[PDB]
Every structure is written in C-alpha cells, then in structure tokens.
Design a protein around this nucleic acid. Structure first.
Ligand SMILES: [K+]
Ligand SMILES: [Mg+2]
Ligand SMILES: [Mg+2]
Ligand SMILES: [Mg+2]
Ligand SMILES: [Mg+2]
Ligand SMILES: [Mg+2]
Ligand SMILES: [Mg+2]
Ligand SMILES: [Mg+2]
Ligand SMILES: [Mg+2]
Ligand SMILES: [Mg+2]
Ligand SMILES: [Mg+2]
Ligand SMILES: [Mg+2]
Ligand SMILES: [Mg+2]
Ligand SMILES: [Mg+2]
Ligand SMILES: [Mg+2]
Ligand SMILES: [Mg+2]
Ligand SMILES: [Mg+2]
Ligand SMILES: [Mg+2]
Ligand SMILES: [Mg+2]
Ligand SMILES: [Mg+2]
Ligand SMILES: [Mg+2]
Ligand SMILES: [Mg+2]
Ligand SMILES: [Mg+2]
Ligand SMILES: [Mg+2]
Lengths: 185, 130, 53, 25, 144
RNA sequence: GAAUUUGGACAAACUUGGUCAUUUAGAGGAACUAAAAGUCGUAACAAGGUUUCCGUAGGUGAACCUGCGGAAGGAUCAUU
RNA sequence: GGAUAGUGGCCUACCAUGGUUUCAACGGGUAACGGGGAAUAAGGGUUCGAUUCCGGAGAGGGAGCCUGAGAAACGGCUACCACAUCCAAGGAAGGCAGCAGGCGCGCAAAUUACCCAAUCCUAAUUCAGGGAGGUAGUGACAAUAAAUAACGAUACAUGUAAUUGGAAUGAGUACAAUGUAAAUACCUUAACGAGGAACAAUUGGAGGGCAAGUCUGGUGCCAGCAGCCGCGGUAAUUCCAGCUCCAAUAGCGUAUAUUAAAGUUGUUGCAGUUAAAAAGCUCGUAGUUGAACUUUGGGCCCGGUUG
RNA sequence: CUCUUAAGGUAGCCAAAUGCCUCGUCAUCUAAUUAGUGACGCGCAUGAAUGGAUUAACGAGAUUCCCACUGUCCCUAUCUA
C-alpha cells in the first residue's frame, strides 16, 4: 500500500485536570489573548515543552560540541526569526527561560490588535476569520500565524475584504440596493 | 434466508427507488408525535414471482412489489411514505382471529435464545399468528 | 418488591423548560467567563465566589 | 475458630475425603 | 549486602529471581494465565450481547436499602448466565423479559461495585436502542 | 510408442487399538462465599470469668474440651 | 555408495557407542509469524507489534506431480478427508486467507462503484493487460487548523437590561473558470445567503478526591445516586426535576486491555522482630563471590590543544 | 421436654450371602432389566476377635456386563464308527 501519512498531536492535557491555579492562569491567558478555548493554551504549552526538552538535551550536551553549536544556533535562529525570543538572548538559556506569553504575543490575532487594526482582541479575531487581514499578497484568515517579525511591517488589510480595498462588501451592497428603493427609485 | 422476509406490498401514489429515504409507518403510529416511525431507507425493490425474485429499479403507483432491506424495524404491516402529514391507511381488518393458543417451551434450556428469536421470526411471517 | 420503578421520576410534579436567552457559544463564552471572573465585578465575596445565596 | 481447631477440622475433612476417594475407584 | 546478588556474572540469577517473584502480581499473573478467557464470562471483552431471562430485585448490602432491580441475562456469545444492573433512575420498565440487551463491565474489572452484591456487569443497550437515550425521552424502544 | 503391468520409494487416507491434551454430563457426598435482623450456646477481646497461642493425639451438637512438649505475642522484665 | 544443483545420516550397507542437559536438555503452554518499530516515557524500564516496509509460511486439511529458470503452484492438475453446485440421475465441475459483495460468528469492521491519467509490473513489447495501483462512496478509528458572533450610539450602574443602528463574514446554494480521465469536494468566485443573527453546542458534573449551590419543588432507607469514602428512614448542598453555576468543547462520557503513577517487582531501587515475609539446625554440589603483591619516580626534548 | 436402661449401636457398613414392606428410591447399564453396579438409609432384624471395614494375589467358589467364538437357538441338515 501507499506510504503511511505521518501525523502527530499538537497538544497535551494537564496531568491534574482541575488545578485551581492552572485553570485561573489558563482563563487569564484566554481572556487576554481572545482564544476560543483551552486547546490553544494546551497546544502552545506543548510546543514550548518540546522546545524546553530540546534545549535541555542540548545543554546537557557538551559546550562547543559541534552538535550543540549547530542545533542550538538553529533553535535561537528560529525563535528570534519568529520573534518569540529577543535579539539579545542568544545563549540557549533564555530559550529554556521562555514563557507562554512570549509565544502568544506573536499570534497574528495579537499582532493585528497591537498594530491598531482592531478595537479589541475579539474584534481582531473576527476580522481575521472574516478574511480581512492580509500579510503580503496573501489573505490569512486564521488567528495563529506565528508572524516572523518581518510580516509585522506588512500586516494590513487585503485588496478584498472591504476595509482596505476596492469592493464595498455584501451587506453594504444590499443596504445600498435598499436605500435606492427608499429614495423612491 | 433467516431474517429478511421480503416486504410484500402495494404502492398507491408515488414511486419507489432502490436507495430511497422512506418513513415506515406503525400500525398504531399517531402522526402528531413520535411513534413507530423510523428513519431508515430501502435497499432494493423487487418484483415477486414464482419462488424466485427479480430485482427492479422503479415502479409507478398501483403496482405490487417486494422490498429488500426492511421488516427488521416493522413487525407486521404499515405503510411507507415520504410526505410529512401522511396518515397511514386502514388496518386491513380480517375475518379470522387467533383463538387457538398453546404453550411453547424448548426442551434444551441452553438454546432458549433461538426459541425467543423464533417466536419473533414467525410473528412477522404469518399476518394472523399472535 | 418490583413494580415501583417510577416512584419519584414519574409520579411527582414535572417542571418544564423555560425560554431563556442563548449563551454566546465559543470565544464569546470565554470572554463572558473572563469578564464575570477577572475584571473584579461584584461577585468576590472576600476572595472568590461564583454563585449567590 | 482457633487456627488450631480450624486445622484439626480441616484434617478430619481431608481424612473423610481420602476415605470416600478410596471407596470410589 | 542487601539480600540479593550484585556480582557482574549474576544476571541470570537476578532475572530468574525476578521471574519467580513476578508471579505475585495479580495483574501479571492474570495476564500470563489468561484468566479473562477461561473465567470472567466476557471473553476478554468489555462488550457482549445477551438475552434477558428474569427481572430480579436484589437487596443492597448493609447499611444500604433500596433493591437495585437487576436482570438475569443469557449471553449469546458463550452461553453463560450473568446478572446485570440497569443503571438509571428506574429505567427497568424499558427492559422486558426475554429481550436482547448489551452488557458491559461495571467499573471495577470484576469486583462487584457498590452495595450491589454479585453484580459485575451493567446494561448499555436494550433491544438495540440505547438504554440512556431510552431513559431520556429522545428515542423509544421498538415494539416487541 | 497409448492402455495394461512387475518390483520399489514417497505416501494421502481408512479401520482397530494405545496414549496424551482440552472441554463436558452425572445419582450422590463434602466444602467455600454472600445475604442475613433465623435456632443453639458463649469460644476469643479484661486474669473474658478455665490466661492466650503453637505442634501433636483423642473426644464432644457446635463453638470447643483434655493429655503431652513448647512460646509470651502474659496476667511476672523484680528475691545477693 | 545413491540422490541432489552440489555440502551433509539427506537416504542406504558395515563399524564404534555416541550426542544434549540444573550454564534448564527433553517435554508442556502461547489468545506466538519474527524484525525494522509503537504506547508510556527523569534515568532505568514495562507492555504491544494480525495490519502500509523487510524476511517467512499458507492458499478448506494433508500428500503427490507434469510443464516450467524458478511451483510441491492451487483464479494448475491427481487422489484421499469434510463440505458443496448442477442434474434430463446416465455425468460434470470445485476451492474469495484477491477486489467488491453475501451468510455465520460476533463488541467489532465500508461500495456486488469508476479508471489505467499518476506509480510501477509482464510481452513478441512505446501501444495491450493490471479489483497491482489510483479516484470517488461509507468513515466522530485516529490526526491538523479553528464557525456559532464583532463594533458603535442610547439608558443606567469598567460593566448590565426584549433600547436601538450601521458595518463583516461564512454554513450554505450556485452560472462560469479551475480542479480531474469525465468527475464530486477542496481553493477564487457574478447573484442569492443574518437580527430572539431559531443559521439556537454538546457531553458530563456542582460533599470530598476535583472546579462549581447549605437555591426551590418533589421523594421520605421508597425511587434511586455513588469508580472510593459515602447520600436518601419529612430540613437530601449527593436522588427526580426547575433555576443558577462548573470542566472540556465539536467534542465529551461509558466498558475492557496496557503504560506512568508503582521505590506496590526495586539492576538503578522495595520489604522480611512486631504490618506478608529468614528455611528447626548443620554439611554440601551446581551457581555467585573471593587478601595483598610484579615499571614507579625522576630529567630532557619534538611537539600538540585552550587564554 | 419427658418416660426409661447395665449400657441405650460408637467408629464403620448396608435393600449387602443380613431389608419384611420390596420388583424400596435415585443414577447407570438395555430397545425393554424382579438381574448387575454406584449411591441414600428411623437399618422387620447391619456392626466391631459371637470380630467391623478395606484389601494386592490366589479360587474347578456365587453373580453382572463386554470383545471374541461358536448349531444354544432362528432351523434344521448331512457324514462316519
Ligand atoms: K443508609
Ligand atoms: Mg468465654
Ligand atoms: Mg478458653
Ligand atoms: Mg478463656
Ligand atoms: Mg464463661
Ligand atoms: Mg501476629
Ligand atoms: Mg559422502
Ligand atoms: Mg499463531
Ligand atoms: Mg509478538
Ligand atoms: Mg510479525
Ligand atoms: Mg491470531
Ligand atoms: Mg476459506
Ligand atoms: Mg484461489
Ligand atoms: Mg447554531
Ligand atoms: Mg472544591
Ligand atoms: Mg441537581
Ligand atoms: Mg511493598
Ligand atoms: Mg508477620
Ligand atoms: Mg583481588
Ligand atoms: Mg450409626
Ligand atoms: Mg439395610
Ligand atoms: Mg447396592
Ligand atoms: Mg441378562
Ligand atoms: Mg451378628
């Protein structure tokens, strides 16, 4: 038969399902970043756990060892590109010392709000899911993008999606059609 | 074959199709509320003949056909419709009634499930047996 | 003895449903929870409380 | 039951079992 | 010296001792002897259809009360007779004598649960319709 | 050079018998567990009203009783 | 010596008594195909691996065989064993553990569809064939992203009320066009497609574990709840419901198996006086283990790697 | 709880070569069994060196069943002295 289609999970439920402090922190993050449910927090903490495991393994590896050098420099390069890790912390220890907010700030849902394109984080989410924000020549209608810190200067509305483009919309078009009626003609 | 018991019946309006969503009707199904109406469909329409069957695709109203894929949800009789306010037709009262009644018991107690299946397999074969 | 299988569920008064506004399913529900719990609206009862008396 | 008397009763039971199994051949 | 050999050439002794002492685990011994196949009427499976034979009222163990209204069921799989709880408030009206019911475990891997004596299985479906959805007003059991 | 055929080896398979393994019926007998608000006594927990317990033997409706040796987990760490 | 493709007790004639084994032979069991691997995973481990790859075996059970480079072949044959089709009773034809499909068994699993366009295979061979294979149908196995609303004004107290308004989109439906072998769907889309946006999110819970009611009506050790502890016998925070609220969320719960938890299998790393556990005592084979001791220290260089 | 003995049949065993009722009851053996065997036992009237129970081996001892075998028989016939 055809080769198996490799797929992996992207999240992991907590060991204790009903921890008060963890539930309160998760709700804090969900409210402050306009997230649909705890699944986003779980996914981002799982991916961060992958990063922490990798960084721990490379730290236990010898310093200046070629494998450590190559893999660590790659890891900081990816993190500084995606914008989670700052430019002045290229030592692989701050990679361990990263946090969930450091990764949730780089969501497109967060960048579009921090650029003033929306009035709230939830307004940002709905504007995104309504295909209104385009990065370059590419409409991106999903909250989580992990902008690479170069798309930040290009995050704007689309030629479509009638806030920064040509057409007037759908409900606007029908409202025009019915005010044409209301005018008498 | 034990337990398919093709569905002999007459169509009066509309057409049947092999693979058609139908609303089977209970003998006591009140159309107002939820009653013996089930949400399954037909598997194959058949024109019945002399102890061998011919599969058919369609028949207009006023025709006599057998159905493959039902009687495992309706016991004795009823109608099959597709409209929403379709009252089932009359109960088809007969001149005879079950008056001869005898007790039935299996002599091997370990094979009772076959017996219970048999009593509900024969109650649907013959229209009069109760 | 048998035949009492409906002593409370069946033969005691049955209050029916009540027309109520729909909840804002999803991210809207998460915002509702965030505002009801973490903007310090009057439900604290000292440290934390989530139902009236 | 004292464990001693439980053991004694069990031994008597075992002797009865041995007798019945000796009868049954 | 801690009562077990440490020597570098004692691997066989250590693994033989571990093999001998692993028989004291109930789970390991059950898995190796295949008890769930010979005993435990469900043939190493959580699920099984069976045929009800009688409705019974079983008195709960002390200090409890309120007989649990279970049913004796004849398994179609192998032919054993097992008593099964019908878990809901009431809900015995929806299971009739000589009716087909699906049986599942009762939560304790055997080890009859709660105050119900000698009942290690519960009813999941009756006549092919869900027992829970039949306790609720969602569905109705077919006429039988 | 077909059919037919002599002697061989490979051998399915059948009968009978033996042996082993796994399920399984069985008059009857003797156990265990659960539910108990059953009958009988009170055997143990206080020196539990005969201190308790172990091994062994015998006996008794039943717990149990008794002989023999042992233990204190005894009711004695105690008589220069 | 025979036979083999050749080696070989592979078989045969003579000869001697050899060969394996407590370092487990032989025998028994396996719900045992093995491995690359998988789940869980501080380390060490434990369990699974019929099933996408590799090797093996088989084609209802054996056995035998022609052809053929290659078969002990089975969509080949021979016969026996059990089934089993047809019959005009004389005969003839069999092996879906291929694709579908059907019965049965079940806890348990899809269409008697389309096509060689992709990948490759066979020939005499560019061309034909291919239920190999791909495509579609069924699919809440599993896995990924994330719709169910967002913003004003007004009224009131950063937020609330059946107080109202303008925007935005897809869930759909669908010309075309793309997608394809013709396709459906996916992406982009003319027009239609929001106002209780009814275009209405559910699954389990609210004593503890474990987040969430001493709310109300019912019930009165009844019905029932409860994985455990436990709740009900007229004040039930636990039942049946109503209201409110909690957790996860297009998923949640239930049952079994396994892993971590389990330092409750302990090699790392368990315990043994009283909780379960030192054999009544000693010898002793196998096994395991077992005192120290033999070239060290100087000095001179060549010369590496890190500040 | 009584009446009552010297003691009131203990361990064992039984419709037994010992049980009337009786062809006892159940099971098995057969198509069918007053037979046989295994059980049960308020056992007319079992029972402990008047020995109780069980026993390998042995028996021209009594009984039941099975294989084989055959004129015992169906059903008789023939031959020799
Ligand atoms: K109680
Ligand atoms: Mg006493
Ligand atoms: Mg005493
Ligand atoms: Mg005493
Ligand atoms: Mg006393
Ligand atoms: Mg003790
Ligand atoms: Mg040679
Ligand atoms: Mg196998
Ligand atoms: Mg394996
Ligand atoms: Mg394998
Ligand atoms: Mg298998
Ligand atoms: Mg087959
Ligand atoms: Mg074949
Ligand atoms: Mg909706
Ligand atoms: Mg709490
Ligand atoms: Mg409630
Ligand atoms: Mg322990
Ligand atoms: Mg102890
Ligand atoms: Mg040494
Ligand atoms: Mg006697
Ligand atoms: Mg007698
Ligand atoms: Mg006898
Ligand atoms: Mg005779
Ligand atoms: Mg005498």
């Amino acid at each position: 038969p055809r080769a198996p289609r490799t797929y992996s999970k992207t999240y992991s439920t907590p060991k204790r399902p009903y921890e008060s402090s963890r539930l309160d922190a998760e709700l804090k993050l969900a409210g402050e970043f306009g997230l649909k449910n705890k699944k986003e927090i779980y996914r981002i903490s799982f991916q961060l756990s992958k990063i922490r495991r990798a960084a721990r393994d490379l730290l236990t590896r010898d310093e200046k060892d070629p494998k450590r050098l190559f893999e660590g420099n790659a890891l900081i390069r990816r993190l500084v590109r995606v914008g989670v890790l700052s430019e002045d912390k290229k030592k692989l220890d701050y990679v361990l010392a990263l946090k969930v907010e450091d990764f949730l700030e780089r969501r497109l849902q967060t960048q579009v709000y921090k650029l003033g394109l929306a009035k709230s984080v939830h307004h940002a989410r709905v504007l995104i899911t309504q295909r209104h924000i385009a990065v370059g020549k590419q409409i991106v209608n999903i909250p989580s993008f992990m902008v690479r810190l170069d798309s930040e200067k290009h995050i704007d509305f689309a030629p479509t999606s009638p806030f920064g483009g040509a057409r007037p919309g759908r409900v606007a078009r029908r409202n025009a059609a019915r005010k044409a009626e209301a005018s008498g003609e | 074959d034990k337990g398919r018991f093709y569905a002999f019946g007459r169509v009066f309006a509309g057409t049947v199709k092999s693979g058609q969503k139908v609303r089977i009707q209970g003998p006591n199904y009140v159309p107002g509320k939820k009653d013996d109406l089930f949400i399954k469909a037909i598997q194959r329409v058949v024109l019945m003949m002399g102890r061998f069957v011919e599969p058919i695709d369609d028949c207009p109203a006023g025709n006599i056909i057998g159905l493959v894929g039902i009687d495992q949800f309706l016991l004795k009789t009823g109608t099959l419709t597709t409209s929403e306010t379709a009252h089932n037709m009359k109960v088809m009262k007969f001149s005879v009634s079950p008056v001869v009644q005898v007790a039935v018991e299996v002599k091997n107690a370990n094979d009772l499930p076959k017996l219970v299946e048999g009593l509900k397999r024969l109650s649907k074969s013959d229209p009069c047996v109760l | 003895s048998l035949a009492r299988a409906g002593k409370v569920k069946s033969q005691t008064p049955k209050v029916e449903k009540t027309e109520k506004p729909k909840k804002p399913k999803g991210r809207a529900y998460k915002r509702l929870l965030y505002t009801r719990r973490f903007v310090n609206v009057t439900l604290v009862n000292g440290k934390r409380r989530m139902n009236p008396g | 039951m004292r464990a001693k008397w439980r053991k004694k009763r069990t031994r008597r039971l075992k002797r009865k079992r041995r007798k019945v199994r000796a009868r049954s051949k | 010296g801690k009562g077990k050999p440490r020597g570098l050439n004692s691997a066989r002794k250590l693994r033989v001792h571990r093999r001998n002492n692993r028989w004291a685990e109930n789970n390991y011994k059950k898995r190796l002897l295949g008890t769930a196949f010979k005993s435990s009427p469900f043939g190493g499976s959580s699920h099984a259809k069976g045929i009800v034979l009688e409705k019974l009222g079983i008195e709960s163990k002390q200090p409890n009360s309120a007989i649990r209204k279970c049913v004796r069921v004849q398994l179609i799989k192998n032919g054993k007779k097992v008593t099964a709880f019908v878990p809901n408030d009431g809900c015995l009206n929806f299971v009739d004598e000589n009716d087909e019911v699906l049986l599942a475990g009762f939560g304790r891997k055997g080890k009859a649960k709660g105050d119900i004596p000698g009942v290690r299985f519960k009813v999941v479906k009756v006549s092919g319709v869900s027992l829970l959805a039949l306790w609720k007003e969602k569905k109705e059991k077919p006429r039988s």
